[PDB]
């Protein structure tokens, strides 16, 4: 039969296999899971939607097929493109904070105005001192943290990369997730043409916005001065 197109949690899409001729093998992608349901005292192995949205069964290289569910009509995973803010810099690595995962801000509330009237970090106020670790995951504006090692900045010339010429504190960097890493940090990479600095300000965040002029250079419109970055290719 035809796969249903709308999907909700607990809804069964299709059995594990199907023949129409060759025997399609169904792989549970994002938004689905392979669950073994029980019916009539007997076993049924089915792909079940775990999300609300349109199901998709697309085809990639007897031959198995990817079954997923897309919302409409999140969490950093390996291969996901995340938009980050450079927080720390060192000769070995660049510390960043994940601000968005796949056009989706994380966290949903950054905690603005929580700490008062000045310019205060997410945990720079009174609330951070009195946070209940026992009853909550993390504090108000707490973000997933990430690391871009110097080796994982470029595809080539990885041995002698100067991270100071690649990123600056405050820069918005488009990166991809290499590994889950540990509890504190994801491990990220910018070693691709579409990955790297997508936003930057002159004088380390103090000046006005600069625009990307060349692969390794941005410049300020009002000053004319040029600064060295690893720019992600626009368009």
């Amino acid at each position: 039969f035809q796969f249903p197109e709308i999907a909700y949690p607990g809804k069964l899409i299709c059995p594990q296999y199907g023949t129409e001729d060759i025997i399609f093998n169904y792989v549970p992608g994002p938004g689905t899971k392979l669950i073994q349901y029980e019916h009539n005292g007997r076993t049924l192995e089915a792909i079940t939607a775990t999300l609300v949205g349109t199901v998709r069964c697309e085809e990639e290289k007897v031959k198995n097929i990817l079954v997923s569910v897309l919302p409409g009509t999140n969490l950093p995973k390996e291969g996901d493109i995340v938009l980050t803010r450079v927080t720390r810099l060192s000769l070995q690595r660049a510390n960043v904070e994940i601000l968005a995962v796949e056009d989706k801000p994380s966290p949903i509330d950054s905690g603005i105005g929580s700490n008062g009237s000045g310019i205060v970090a997410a945990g720079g106020g009174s609330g951070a001192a009195t946070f209940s670790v026992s009853q909550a995951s993390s504090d108000l504006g707490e973000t997933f943290r990430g690391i871009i090692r110097s080796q994982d900045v470029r595809s080539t010339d990885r041995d002698r990369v100067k991270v100071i010429e690649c990123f600056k504190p405050g820069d918005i960097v488009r990166a991809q997730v290499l590994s889950l890493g540990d509890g504190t940090n994801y491990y990220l990479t910018t070693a691709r043409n579409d990955l790297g600095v997508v936003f930057a300000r002159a004088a380390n965040g103090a000046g006005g916005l600069m625009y990307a002029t060349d692969w390794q250079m941005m410049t300020s419109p009002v000053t004319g001065a040029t600064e060295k970055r690893k720019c992600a290719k626009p368009f």
Binding site: S110, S114, N115
Partner: protein, 314 residues
């Protein structure tokens, strides 16, 4: 052509988002410069005196208000207590309420700077705007005398002193920007709906106890009831302006949508009375130069906003 959703753009470059929107004559909250969010009110729905016919016995809420502005919701409830007293327009003869503001954001734990400062400023502004005279919180104790011999009846006048103490619990759902104004207005409507329960009595002392049904109006000075407004002053950066196929500054009303809250550092906040007088004024020039013109436009807008908020219901 790389593209960011307005949400994540507000996260990534709040300043750029704000400037870019302002170049089109709009704001990242999709309202124009002097356009306030509309407000909707459900008044006295949580109170025990909500239904005069069938008064809720278990309920202890003296006053109630549910405000909604934009997508933000504020629920204010007024409870009460009694303190034993011991031993003009001047501030000494006035009282205030004791509010606890709980702004619903992801965390759980003790109060944030936001909640604490909003609570305290609510208290202080209630005190200084002189909306609640101490005299109005005075309790006139009736006495419970025994029916003949066999039960009990209470007699109220148409011997120690006592005073009413008002408490306010204010919860804020779906916060998108500064919420002090909403809390203030909500607390105002809530205070207007408060009914003070009547109280009676029987080195040793007997307890005072509130009547179950009878209640007298909390008489507040309606003359001194103000409403809250806030404004941002933004300096236009020539480079971030859209083509829309030498320095300027614009005034913005009713801040929201993070981009504004993160970017704007020059702010004005006003408690203004419908009569024309002002109860509170706060100027913070953290960013752009605050000029007299901006102050005057702010006062004007605050007063029309006040007339609006005081008239729109009843």
């Amino acid at each position: 052509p790389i593209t960011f959703p307005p949400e994540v753009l507000a996260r990534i470059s709040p300043e750029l988002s704000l400037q870019r929107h302002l170049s089109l004559g709009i704001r990242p909250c999709l309202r124009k410069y002097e356009e306030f969010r509309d407000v909707a009110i459900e008044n006295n729905t949580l109170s025990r005196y909500a239904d005069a016919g069938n008064i809720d016995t278990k309920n202890n809420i003296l006053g109630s208000n549910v405000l909604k502005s934009g997508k933000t919701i504020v629920i204010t409830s007024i409870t009460g207590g009694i303190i034993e007293e011991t031993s003009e327009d001047i501030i000494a003869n006035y009282a205030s309420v004791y509010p606890v503001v709980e702004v619903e954001r992801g965390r759980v734990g003790a109060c944030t700077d936001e909640e604490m400062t909003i609570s305290q400023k609510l208290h202080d502004s209630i005190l200084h705007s002189r909306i609640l005279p101490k005299k109005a919180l005075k309790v006139k104790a009736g006495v419970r005398s025994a029916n003949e011999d066999g039960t009990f009846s209470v007699l109220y006048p148409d011997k120690r002193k006592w005073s009413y103490v008002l408490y306010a619990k204010i919860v804020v759902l779906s916060r998108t920007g500064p919420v002090f104004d909403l809390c203030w207005n909500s607390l105002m409507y809530a205070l207007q709906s408060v009914k003070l329960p009547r109280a009676f009595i029987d080195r040793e002392t007997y307890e005072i106890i509130c009547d179950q049904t009878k209640s007298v109006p909390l008489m507040i000075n309606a003359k001194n009831i103000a409403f809250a407004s806030n404004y941002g002053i933004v300096e236009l950066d020539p480079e971030c302006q859209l083509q829309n196929s030498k320095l300027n500054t614009v005034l913005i009303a009713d801040l929201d949508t993070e981009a504004e809250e993160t970017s704007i550092h020059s702010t004005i906040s006003i408690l203004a009375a419908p009569s024309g007088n002002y109860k509170q004024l706060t100027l913070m020039g953290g960013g752009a130069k605050i000029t007299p013109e901006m102050i005057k436009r702010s006062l004007l807008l605050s007063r029309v906003r006040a007339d609006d908020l005081s008239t729109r219901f009843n």
